[PDB]
Amino acid sequence: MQSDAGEFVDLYVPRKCSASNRIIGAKDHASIQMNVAEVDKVTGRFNGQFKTYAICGAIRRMGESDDSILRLAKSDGIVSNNF
């Protein structure tokens, strides 16, 4: 987003929905920022690190927030691939 010289000029960079790959508008109030906790392999206990996801307003009220969160988690290997 930079000029001829190479100076990043726009006053901020908006987030993009993990499911749809739309940019989450400055006032898309039905957009979520959901942290799914990362668990230690040997104990099964919380580490203090998380696998964060963003989703757009249209996707949520479409009713595809459930399957999209699921598929992102199953891609990361949080949910078992077998499922």
Binding site: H29, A30, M34, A37, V39, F46, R61, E64, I69, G77
Partner: protein, 217 residues
């Protein structure tokens, strides 16, 4: 949820689900809840897949553990069935319970007495608790729901496919979320089975209360 033998579904937990009757969905089926259903019976009731119940329940447990301050998780049930279970969950974890009649504008109205401002919503039945979901449209607020086969997944981000109708089923599903949150946190051990009996969560209707008030007397 998976790739781990520690978070794996135990032979103890299966008998608890079958005894409560959480594997049994409704007669009618939603189009976005097909992936959580094994098969339809002769009698025409849908059998919910208990692995896919467990995978989503652990995903929900993870999402609740990642929230740091435990008192900006609002737990909700408007009907009779959940009112005990959410208060038990609330006291046991530190989550803030809204039991019976969610007044419209607790997240939207600044001037209200009960102007709450949570970071995660856990809901018993989207059809009954439709107002907290429709209101969590106005605030950037992820939603968890005890969704039945009949449930619409509009404004629901992780739907745990269960029976949310039966009084035993609601009680246990709240109990296993309450326990997995505490285990993952590192408060209870996976070595020992949990102190609390799941009947501490169940809804005793006045009829059962009066019959037992004569029984024990």
């Amino acid at each position: 949820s998976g790739a781990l033998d520690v978070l794996q579904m135990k032979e103890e937990d299966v008998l608890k689900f079958l005894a409560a009757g959480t594997h049994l969905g409704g007669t009618n089926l939603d189009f976005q809840m097909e992936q959580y259903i094994y098969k339809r019976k002769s009698d025409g009731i849908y059998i919910i897949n208990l692995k896919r119940t467990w995978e989503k329940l652990l995903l929900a447990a993870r999402a609740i553990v990642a929230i740091e301050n435990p008192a900006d998780v609002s737990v909700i049930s408007s009907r009779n069935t959940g009112q005990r279970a959410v208060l038990k969950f609330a006291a046991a974890t530190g989550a803030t319970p809204i039991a019976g009649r969610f007044t419209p504008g607790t997240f939207t109205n600044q001037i209200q007495t009960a102007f709450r401002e949570p970071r995660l919503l856990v809901v018993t039945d989207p059809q009954a608790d439709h107002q907290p979901l429709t209101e969590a449209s106005y605030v950037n607020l992820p939603t968890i729901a005890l969704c039945n086969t009949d449930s619409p997944l509009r404004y629901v981000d992780i739907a745990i496919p269960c029976n949310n109708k039966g009084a035993h089923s609601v009680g246990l599903m709240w109990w296993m979320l309450a326990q997995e949150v505490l285990r993952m946190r590192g408060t209870i051990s996976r070595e020992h089975p949990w102190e609390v009996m799941p009947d501490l969560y169940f809804y005793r209707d006045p009829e059962e209360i009066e019959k037992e008030e004569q029984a024990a007397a």
